[PDB]
Amino acid sequence: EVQLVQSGAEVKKPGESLKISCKGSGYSFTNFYIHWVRQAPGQRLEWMGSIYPNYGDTAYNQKFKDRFVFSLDTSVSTAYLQISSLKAEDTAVYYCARGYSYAMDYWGQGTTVTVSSASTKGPSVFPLAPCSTAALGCLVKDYFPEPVTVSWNSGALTSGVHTFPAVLQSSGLYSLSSVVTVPSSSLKTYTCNVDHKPSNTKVDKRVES
Amino acid sequence: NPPTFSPALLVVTEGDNATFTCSFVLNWYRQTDKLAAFPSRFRVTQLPNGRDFHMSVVRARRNDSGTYLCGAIIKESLRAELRVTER
Amino acid sequence: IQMTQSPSSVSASVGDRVTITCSASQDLNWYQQKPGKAPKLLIYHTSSLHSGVPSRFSGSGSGTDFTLTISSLQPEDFATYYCQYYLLTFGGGTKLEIKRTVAAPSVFIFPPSDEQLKSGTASVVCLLNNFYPREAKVQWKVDNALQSGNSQESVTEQDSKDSTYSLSSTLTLSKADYEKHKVYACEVTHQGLSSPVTKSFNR
């Protein structure tokens, strides 16, 4: 019953502004703290701060002091996290959490924030093929922003499939690879289905050995 | 399913009543020191729905500031803070 | 006010007892987080279980040392656990992985495609398939010249069927530099291998 729903993903440029919303339901919003936690990609959780819907009590981690601001809306039961002068190091997953002064007992689903100088770009899909286990795949290179969905043979092939986490290149664009291991005797068509929603890009790439 | 104690923070002025809510023998604690039990200035009142309980501090004093919780016997709730500002 | 969560990672089987420790320098909360999901509160007040947490989770604390214990591991318990004290501060975190036998990686290398080469870039991919433990090292060599700073890699989560990991490394060069060299190889070191394994191709 206790739910905290956050706003959708945010893709901003270095120097812009954004305000993540956090609406609580199933409880009296004015009776519990709202905490904010940041988790950089592949890193640990770090407490950013907390704010109470009454009396103006706020606490801040010294690292997120003057550039991060917490706001609240009691009559609508919604918490806000506004970040100004956006920097590339702010790319992380930001959680809002209901709780007390010392604990966070119910968490929102989280909001992924991506800050880069890159714009929306469709990916280029290249084959991964060699020159008794054989391996082939697709290289989904230079796209922005996340995410990309990859399936094989329209989803009919799932066993032996490995779709790796995307890496962020120095150019601000992402790159992803998805492979599948098959018996060498089966080399019998293998096609990866790449879908990049923000660029409206849909590609089916036949991988020839 | 331990009880729930709210508000997490309650600030009142000296003289007025500080009322918390415990939702779930039920004991009111402020180590823990028992204040009241269901069934002085610390009274426990059952709400019409039977599941919520008002835990009020009649005429709160400055030294009543601290952390409070409720427990069902011994499953405890989270700790709420009470502030009593001078007048 | 300095806490240390140990160990960094735990490997165990279904049914084992696992103890995660957070020790200070001079109450504690425990959280559980699965990959791509929001954390959940497990323990508060050092030893109180949160609503809905099964009784196989238990916490204890003696002064500066605090321990989280999972008596009998279930398949749903493999995740990352954080301790938190109070300004709130999380510990370093402890990843609980599935134990299995040592498995050497199957190494594959993929040359750049003609379509990518026509755009002006050459990407070389080295696949390390189904290995355990997760510790693995990939070294790119171009005409016996060790490459550094021009490659990126990523590792999948522990597999749900065989409990193995897979690694994919991508070496990226310009088309001009790619055409000026012949031998491209990735050398893989893993405790499941007797010696460093090298897979290569000739341009």
Element of type H or E holding A20: strand A18-25
Supply A51's token pair.
Answer: 């704010």
Q: Note whether C60 and C67 are within 8 A (CB).
A: yes
Residues C87 and C106 in one domain: no
CB nearest to B6's CB, from A28, A52, A102:
A28
Supply C76's token pair.
Answer: 């749903």
Residues C188 and C107 in one domain: yes
Residue-range domain boundaries for chain B:
1-87
Distance between C93 CA and the closest CA of chain A, angstroms: 7
> Which parts of chain A fold into alpha helices (H)?
none
Residues C132 and C48 in one domain: no
- Structural domains of chain A, with CATH: 1-117 (no CATH), 118-209 (2.60.40.10)
Q: Which residues of C140-166 are buried (b: 16+ CB within 10 A; e: fewer)?
A: bbbeeeebeeebbbbbbebeeeebbbb
Instruction: Provide the domain limits for residue C193.
Output: 100-203
- From chain B, the residues in CB contact with A1 under 8 A are none
Contacts of residue C166, Cβ cutoff 8 Å, sequence gap at least 6? A162, A164, A179, C105, C127, C128, C129, C130, C131, C155, C156, C159
CB nearest to B79's CB, from A28, A31, A100:
A100
Q: How many CB pairs under 8 A join A and C?
A: 119
- Per the listing, tokens 């509160």 go with C41
Whole-angstrom distance, CA of residue A139 vs CA of residue A150: 10
Q: Do A137 and C110 touch (CB under 8 A)?
A: yes
Q: What is the CATH number of domain B1-87?
A: 2.60.40.10
Whole-angstrom distance, CA of residue B47 vs CA of residue B49: 6
Q: Kindly report the backbone phi and psi dihedral angles of residue A88, in degrees, each rounded to the nearest multiple of 5, phi listed first.
A: -65, -25
What is the biggest distance separating any 2 CA atoms in chain A, rounded to whole angstroms?
72
Q: Note whether B70 and B77 are within 8 A (CB).
A: yes
Whole-angstrom distance, CA of residue C93 vs CA of residue C82: 5
Distance between C122 CA and the closest CA of chain A, angstroms: 11
Q: Note whether C17 and C27 are within 8 A (CB).
A: no
Element of type H or E holding A203: strand A201-206
**Interface check A16 vs B, CB under 8 A:** no
Which chain A residue has its CA at the smallest distance from B68's CA?
A100
Interface of B to C at Cβ within 8 Å reads: 1-2, 75-76, 78-79
Q: Say which amino acid occupies B35.
A: L
Between β-strands B80-85 and B9-13, what pairing exists: parallel, antiparallel or unpaired? parallel
Residues C93 and C38 in one domain: yes
Instruction: Give the neighbours of chain C: at least 3 Cβ pairs within 8 Å.
Output: A, B
Q: Do A57 and B9 touch (CB under 8 A)?
A: yes
Q: Kindly report the backbone phi and psi dihedral angles of residue C180, in degrees, each rounded to the nearest multiple of 5, phi listed first.
A: -95, 10
For residue A175, the cross-strand partners are: A141, A167
DSSP letter, residue C175: H
DSSP three-state, residue A186 = helix
Contacts of residue B75, Cβ cutoff 8 Å, sequence gap at least 6? B1, B2, B3, C48
Among C99, C126, C158, identify where a domain stops: C99
**Cβ neighbours, 10 Å, residue C134:** 16
CB nearest to A177's CB, from C91, C106, C125:
C125
Resolution of the determined structure in angstroms stands at: 2.2
Interface of A with B in 22-61 (CB under 8 A): 28, 30-33, 52, 54-55, 57
Whole-angstrom distance, CA of residue C178 vs CA of residue C122: 7
**Cβ neighbours, 10 Å, residue A52:** 23
Among C68, C83, C99, identify where a domain stops: C99
CB nearest to B1's CB, from C45, C48, C51:
C51
- From chain C, the residues in CB contact with A166 under 8 A are 154
**Cβ neighbours, 10 Å, residue A92:** 20
Residues C95 and C163 in one domain: no
CB nearest to A100's CB, from B11, B21, B80:
B80
**Interface check C50 vs B, CB under 8 A:** yes
DSSP letter, residue C147: P
Residues C74 and C12 in one domain: yes
Q: Do C84 and A107 touch (CB under 8 A)?
A: no
- From chain C, the residues in CB contact with A163 under 8 A are 156
Q: Kindly report the backbone phi and psi dihedral angles of residue A26, in degrees, each rounded to the nearest multiple of 5, phi listed first.
A: 80, 10
Residues C26 and C95 in one domain: yes
Distance between C155 CA and the closest CA of chain B, angstroms: 39
Instruction: Please tell me the experimental approach by which this structure was elucidated.
Output: X-ray
DSSP letters for B14-81: BTB-EEEEEE--EEEE----EEEEE---EEEEE-TTSSEEEEEETT--GGG-EEEEEEE--EE-PPEE
Residues C136 and C87 in one domain: no
Q: How many residues does chain B have?
A: 87
Residues C43 and C109 in one domain: no
Q: Note whether C75 and C15 are within 8 A (CB).
A: no
DSSP three-state, residue A190 = coil
Q: Note whether A126 and C124 are within 8 A (CB).
A: no
**Cβ neighbours, 10 Å, residue C189:** 14
Residues C180 and C84 in one domain: no
Residues C45 and C66 in one domain: yes
Among C34, C64, C99, identify where a domain stops: C99
